[PDB]
Amino acid sequence: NYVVENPSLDLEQYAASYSGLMRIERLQFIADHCPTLRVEALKMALSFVQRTFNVDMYEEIHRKLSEATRELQNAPDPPALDTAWVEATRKKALLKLEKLDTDLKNYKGNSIKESIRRGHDDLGDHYLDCGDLSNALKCYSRARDYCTSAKHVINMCLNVIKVSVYLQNWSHVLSYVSKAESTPEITQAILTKLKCAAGLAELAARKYKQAAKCLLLASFDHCDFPELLSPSNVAIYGGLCALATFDRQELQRNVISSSSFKLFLELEPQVRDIIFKFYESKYASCLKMLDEMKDNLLLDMYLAPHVRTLYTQIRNRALIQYFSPYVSADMHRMAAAFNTTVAALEDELTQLILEGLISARVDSHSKILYARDVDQRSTTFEKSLLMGKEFQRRAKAMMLRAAVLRNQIHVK
Amino acid sequence: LVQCILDNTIHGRIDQVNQLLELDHQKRGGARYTALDKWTNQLNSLNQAVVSKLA
Amino acid sequence: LFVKFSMPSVPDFETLFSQVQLFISTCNGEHIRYATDTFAGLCHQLTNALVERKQPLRGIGILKQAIDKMQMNTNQLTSIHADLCQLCLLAKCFKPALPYLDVDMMDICKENGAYDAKHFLCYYYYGGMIYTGLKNFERALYFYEQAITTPAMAVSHIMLESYKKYILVSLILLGKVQQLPKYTSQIVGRFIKPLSNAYHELAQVYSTNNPSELRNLVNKHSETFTRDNNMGLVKQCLSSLYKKNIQRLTKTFLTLSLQDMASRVQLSGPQEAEKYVLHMIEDGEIFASINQKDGMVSFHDNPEKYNNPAMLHNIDQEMLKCIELDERLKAMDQEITVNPQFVQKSM
Amino acid sequence: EHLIAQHSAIKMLHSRVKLILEYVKASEAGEVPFNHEILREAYALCHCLPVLSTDKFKTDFYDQCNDVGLMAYLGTITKTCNTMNQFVNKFNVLYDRQ
């Protein structure tokens, strides 16, 4: 699976780039999946978790930090939660929350749709601050009723998208992205935020071809988008998905035409080199860097399971693209076109031929990969004869069926 | 040569073992037998499915 | 004579058999086709006596004459065929059957209403076993498939064993269980899949493509497949898996060494791989060559360019077959046009 | 009318051949002993009667024959499956319901 042992993560930048519950979940993911660095990740997590009235997840994080500190007290041979925080946090949280509940119930008795919608959004934000997922949803799911303006609908969609990411109800995200896009007549770049929401939601839904297409349409003018995904990861997410799905012509057109992914490639020069090396047929340098970035994003919140399939697809596509211009390519040179061994490439090539889309034959005598260019006519005639034989067999079958049905032959 | 082939500008292939650039001749006049075979297989599977469903 | 066979007063069978032979030799059954029920029962009792005394060699010839006399055309299937194939299977004499089994016979005689579908079910099961014994896996699978698709309101052992043999032949020939058709059958399909789990389990491991794991499963379920009257089919399934792996290597390799071929297919040594390739080339399954000097085996494509008169002659033979099939279809369409209900609806 | 067209073309060719043969037979007995150009050219022209071929021409002829035969087989399959469809449509009517 994942949970590997990799050094060199920059905790300060990754924590500061995100903000909110999005930051909290990522810090929890980093700590749980990266040992030998979990303590500082947990120490930084609990330092930020106590801010903005966390109740249930604080107990889980504090318990994990207490276990982590206890582990450090036995290897080179547990912090107090300061329960006064509970007394302080609960009394403060309740008082303002009831006062906010106080004010909104006045507006329910005053009957103003926008005021009711705005108050419930504040209640939803407060519940999210208080650490109440479903409670925030119901406030948002009853503020959706009292909408009056298109911007109010846009704000309603954004709030539901934000919550459903935490709830992992990505179906609700995609539905509200479609509602927020298709309805209002397809400087304020609002569609860019919606496209970013769809791209990450699709990627979390094990979708790659649409996620890359949506991510490539995201303009860099959005800049600060920390509640869902940092721009640095967006560029990484877009580049990996484009590499696995977009072909060479598809890659070149979309990257250049977007003119925002060029900026995204500037933030992440590593993935930019990958596509350029992918284009110029230097898959040896392309894949060695790929493993270097692998360990880094192997501890990414919504990438770790998906990227393993993405990287496997990248290796398959690179091999297909490499051998495509060659009718007879030496397997030694193809093996030398990566750090892989001769035997390992032969097994990988054999697997690719079994799956398909390489159309090649392996001459293991001299270890030379000869491309298969079978004439269309021979295969056409063979499969036409097979089709005729199958048609004759099915004709005999239906002939027998008609005979037995006309003669009323059946077991009583 | 690799870049030109990957750009579909060269209708040919490369033999790196012998340092050779084998270009397809395109004199076969094909690409019609492929369509005929696709039509044959698709419509014969169609007929088989129709017969199976109707019987 | 039928009355005699229906009574337990059957005398010296030697004189009785001679009288039957004399009757068949001098037979003028211009009207035996009316009393088909009596003759069908006579064959069944004769076959049952042959099985009881375990002398099914002579019954093949007599039953061959019986089918010829009563049937109208060569495309008619009767109940005597089921007993005829049973005698061939018990006597292990498949020579006479193949001439009479290679004829595809779509006219089931009702035997004046006495034709039970058990005879239809038994004929296809026994016929499939005869084809299985003669290594005709394609026709055996076809016969088993036809037996499976018989509509039946009840579950029978003969049907169950026909389904089990269908899986075994499908694994040998196609390497996988062929999906049952959609013109289908009745609760036969519903119950048997819950019934033959082990044969489906064998297919599942066969799909995993691991002879070592497949052999381990065979040993685990050795007694389960022993209720088959045949264990060789499982060994034939293993050999087919070995052959299928070799065939898959041809589609992926142009030249492969014996040592690497043995390692991939998990063989004991290069000599076994050379023998396996040599046997498959003899059977006409592989187009390859072996280089003993370098220990390499060079695979090749199909050398058939379809530019020879042989392919044209085969196409013309298929032309004749399809034309005859279409003529039979038109004759059936005319016969259906003759019926009263269609004319009543049209008028 | 198809075969009759080729039949008439072959009749025209045979008439030309019989005229040439009659001229040769007459020259054998009378006429001009040697018509020069005519006779030499007719000799060279029979030299083209066995147009004669090589492996490539026979291969291409068999290739075209096999292609048209496969197309004919496909057409026969289409006609047969249409007949089967009509038969199945009637068979779903006479006895079967639904």
Query: What is the 3 state secondary structure string of D24-72?
Result: HHHHHHCCCCCCCHHHHHHHHHHCCCCCCCCHHHHHHHHHHHHHHHHHH
Rg (CA), chain D: 27
> Token digits for A107?
């507006």
Give the position of tokens 């869902």: A228
Three-class secondary structure of residue C257 per DSSP: strand
Q: Please say whether the beta carbons of C120 and C150 come within 8 A.
A: yes
Hey, what are A399's tokens? 């002939």
CB-CB neighbours of A328 under 10 Å = 18
Rounded Cα gap, residues C50 and C59, in angstroms: 7
Spatial CB neighbours of A291, under 8 Å, sequence gap ≥ 6? none
User: What percent of chain B is helix, strand and coil (3-state, nearest 5)?
Assistant: 50, 15, 35
Which residue has 């004919």 as its token pair? Answer: D72
Query: Helix (H, G, I), strand (E, B), or coil: what is residue C291?
Result: strand
Query: Phi, psi at residue D18, to the nearest 5°?
Result: -70, -35
Residue C87 neighbours by CB distance under 10 Å: 26
CA distances to B8, B33, C303, D64 from D61, in Å = 34, 17, 19, 5
Tell whether B17 lies on the interface with C, counting CB pairs under 8 A.
Answer: no
Which positions ≥6 away from A370 have C-beta within 8 Å? A327, A328, A360, A361, A362, A363, C254
Q: Helix, strand or coil for residue C251?
A: helix
CB-CB neighbors (< 8 A) of A329 in chain B: 14-17
- Binary contact (D87, A402; C-beta < 8 A): yes
H-run or E-run covering B14: strand B12-15
CA–CA distance, A326 with B52 (Å, rounded to integer): 45
For residue A394 the two structure tokens come to 């099915």
> What's the CA gap between C88 and C61, in Å, rounded?
10
Q: For the stretch C3-34, what's the b/e string if a residue is b when 16 or more beta carbons lie within 10 angstroms of its beta carbon?
A: eebeeeeeeeeeebeeebeeeeeeeeeeeeee
Q: Are A256 and A276 in contact (CB under 8 A)?
A: no
Q: For D55, name the nearest residue in chain C, comparing CA atoms only.
A: C307
Closest by Cβ to B40, choosing from D74, D85, D91: D74
Q: What is the DSSP letter of C298?
A: E
Query: How many residues does this entry show for chain D?
Result: 98
The nearest alpha carbon in chain D to A403 belongs to: D91
Instruction: Give the whole-angstrom CA distance, residue A258 versus residue A199.
Output: 15
Task: Indicate yes or no: CB of D93 within 8 angstroms of CB of C307.
Answer: no
Residue contact A384–D74, C-beta within 8 A? yes
SS3 C288: strand
Chains meeting C at 3+ CB pairs closer than 8 A? Answer: A, B, D
DSSP structure class, residue C180: P
User: Could you tell me if residue A185 is left (phi over 0), alpha (psi between -120 and 50 degrees) or otherwise beta?
Assistant: left
What is the arrangement of strands in the sheet containing A326-330, beginning at the earlier edge strand?
B20-23, B12-15, A326-330, A368-371, A360-363, C253-257, C296-299, C288-291
Backbone φ and ψ for C284, nearest 5 degrees, come out as: 85, 25
Residues of A in contact with B7 (CB under 8 A): 249
* CA angle centred on D78, ends D76 and D82, rounded to 5°: 115
Cα gap A400→C255, rounded to integer Å: 46
Q: Could you count the other beta carbons within 10 Å of the beta carbon of residue A334?
A: 24
A315 torsion bin: left (phi>0), alpha (psi -120 to 50), beta (else): alpha
Backbone Cα Rg of chain C = 25
Contact between D87 and C312 using a beta-carbon 8 Å cutoff: no
Locus of tokens 């519903």: C190
Start-to-end CA span in chain C (Å): 51
Tokens 């479609």 belong to which residue? A178
Other Cβ atoms within 10 Å of B31 Cβ, number: 9
Helix, strand counts (H, E) of chain C: 17, 3
Which residues are paired to C296 by β-bridges? C257, C291
* Contact yes or no for C104 and A410 at CB 8 A: no
List, in sequence order, every residue forming a beta bridge with C297; answer none if it has no partner: C256, C290
| All residues at 6 or more sequence positions from A252 whose CB lies less than 8 Å from its CB, including other chains | A279
- Phi/psi zone of residue A189: left (φ > 0), alpha (ψ -120 to 50 degrees), beta? beta
- The radius of gyration of chain B from alpha carbons, rounded to an integer in Å, stands at 20
Own/partner contacts of A146-152, CB < 8 Å, gap of 24 or more, are A146/A113, A146/A114, A146/A116, A146/A117, A146/A120, A147/A113, A147/A117, A148/A113, A148/A114, A148/A117, A149/A114, A150/A183, A150/A184, A152/A114, A152/A117
| Range A232-249 burial, b when 16+ CB lie within 10 A, else e | ebbbbbbbbbbbbbbebe
Compute the distance between CA of residue D70 and CA of residue A379 in angstroms, rounded to an integer. 13
Task: State the DSSP code for C108.
Answer: B
| Residues 54-73 in D contacting C (C-alpha not used; CB under 8 Å) | 59, 62-63, 65-66, 69-70, 72-73
Q: Collect all residues of chain A within an 8 Å Cβ-Cβ radius of residue C315.
A: 385
B52: contact with C, CB 8 A cutoff: yes
CA–CA separation, C277 vs C243, rounded Å? 9
Per-residue b/e over A63-83, b at no fewer than 16 CB within 10 Å?
A: ebbbebeeeeeeeeeeeebee
**Residues in chain C closer than 8 A to D84 (CB atoms):** 329
Residue A276's closest CA among A251, A294, A258, A296? A251
Place of tokens 């990414």: A300
Tokens of A164: 């459903």
Spatial separation of the C-alpha atoms in residues A223 and A231, rounded to whole Å: 7
Of C80, C7, C6, the C-alpha closest to C43 is C80
Torsional sign, CA C44, C49, C52, C57: negative
DSSP secondary structure code for residue C56 in this structure: -
A-C interface: how many C-beta pairs under 8 angstroms?
113
8-state DSSP, C77: B
Q: What are phi and psi of B25, to 5 degrees?
A: -90, -25
Rounded CA-CA distance C108/C78 in Å is 6
CB contacts of C330 in chain D (<8 Å) are 83
Measured CA to CA, the distance from residue D73 to residue A250 in angstroms comes to 42
Give me the long-range contacts of D78-84 (CB less than 8 A, separation at least 24).
D79/C326, D80/A391, D80/A395, D80/C322, D80/C325, D80/C326, D80/C329, D81/A391, D81/B47, D81/B51, D83/C326, D83/C329, D83/C330, D83/C333, D84/A395, D84/A398, D84/B51, D84/C329
D50 sits in the region (left: phi over 0; alpha: psi -120 to 50; else beta) called beta
Is-contact C151 C220, C-beta < 8 A?
A: no
Going C124 to C129 to C131 to C137, the CA torsion angle's sign is positive
Q: How far is C202 from C198, CA to CA, in rounded Å?
A: 6
Cross-chain residue pair A248–B5, CB shorter than 8 Å: no
**CA–CA separation, B1 and B23 (whole Å):** 11
Q: Give contacts of D76 with chain C, Cβ < 8 Å.
A: 319, 322-323, 326
CB < 8 Å from B in window 153-182 of C: 181-182
Is D91–A384 a contact, with Cβ atoms under 8 angstroms apart? no
Q: Which two tokens stand for residue A123?
A: 């209640």
Q: What residues have CB less than 8 Å from D52, skipping those under 6 apart?
A: none
> Per the structure block, which two tokens stand in for C100?
């009479």
Residue with tokens 């709830």: A167
- Chain D residues lying within 8 Å of C322, measured CB to CB: 73, 76-77, 80
- Nearest Cα neighbor of A349 from A318, A391, A378, A390 is A318
Which tokens hold the place of C141? Answer: 């699978």
Angle at A178 between CA A174 and CA A184, to 5 degrees: 150
Q: Residue C153 carries which DSSP code?
A: S
Residues 371-390 of A with CB under 8 A from B: 371, 376-377, 379-380, 383-384, 387, 390
Distance of CA D54 to the CA centre of its chain: 20
Structural domain boundaries of chain C? Answer: 1-115, 116-248, 249-303
Q: How far apart are CA C91 and CA C110, in angstroms?
A: 28
Q: C277: number of CA atoms within 13 Å, CB side?
A: 30
Chain D residues whose CB is inside 8 A of the A381 CB are 66, 70
Tokens of C104: 């595809």
**Angstrom distance (rounded) from CA A42 to CA A65:** 6
Token couple for C281: 């080339």
Chain D neighbors (3+ CB pairs < 8 Å):
A, B, C
Distance from CA of C12 to the nearest CA of B (A): 52
Chains with 3 or more CB pairs under 8 A to chain B: A, C, D
Residue D20, helix vs strand vs coil: helix
Distance from CA of D71 to the nearest CA of C (A): 11
What span, in angstroms and rounded, lies between the C-alpha atoms of C100 and C290? 41
Contact C82/C119 with Cβ under 8 angstroms?
A: yes
Nearest-CA distance A329 → chain B (Å): 6
Please report, for residues A13, A19, A37, A47, the alpha-carbon distance to residue A10 in angstroms, rounded to integers and kept in the order given: 6, 16, 11, 17
In whole angstroms, give the CA distance from residue A306 to residue A264. 21
* Chain D residues near residue C328 by CB distance under 8 angstroms: none
What does the alpha-carbon distance between residue A194 and residue C75 come to, in Å, rounded to a whole number? 70
C-beta of residue A243 within 8 angstroms of C-beta of residue A278:
yes
Residue C92, classified by CB atoms within 10 Å of its CB into exposed (0-12), middle (13-18) or buried (19+), is exposed
Q: Quote the minimal CA–CA distance from A333 to chain C in Å.
A: 18
Task: Write a three-state SS string for chain A.
Answer: CCCCCCCCCCHHHHHHHCCCHHHHHHHHHHHHHCCCCHHHHHHHHHHHHCCCCCCHHHHHHHHHHHHHHHHHCCCCCCCCCCCHHHHHHHHHHHHHHHHHHHHHHHHHHHCCHHHHHHHHHHHHHHHHHHCCHHHHHHHHHHHCCCCCCHHHHHHHHHHHHHHHHHHCCHHHHHHHHHHHHHCCCCCCCHHHHHHHHHHHHHHHCCCCHHHHHHHHCCCHHHCCCCCCCCHHHHHHHHHHHHHHHCCHHHHHHHHHHHCCHHHHHHHCHHHHHHHHHHHCCCHHHHHHHHHHHHHHHCCCCCCHHHHHHHHHHHHHHHHHHHHCCEEEEEHHHHHCCCCCCHHHHHHHHHHHHHHCCCCEEEECCCCEEEECCCCHHHHHHHHHHHHHHHHHHHHHHHHHHHHHHHCCCCEC
DSSP state of B16: T
Coil, strand or helix: which one is C283?
coil
CB interface of D with B, residues 72-91, below 8 Å: 74, 77, 81, 84-85, 88-89, 91
Mode of pairing for the β-strands spanning C253-257 and B20-23: unpaired
Q: CA A257, A259, A265, A271: dihedral to nearest 10 degrees?
A: -10
What is the C-alpha to C-alpha distance for residues A240 and A237, in angstroms, rounded to an integer?
Answer: 6
Token pair 């005394």 is at which residue?
A: C53
Indicate the length of chain C as a whole number: 347
Cross-chain Cβ contact B1/A321 below 8 Å: no
Could you tell me which residues are beta bridge partners of residue A335? none
Of all residues in chain A, the one with the smallest CA distance to C315 is A385
How far does CA A244 lie from the centroid of its chain? Answer: 13
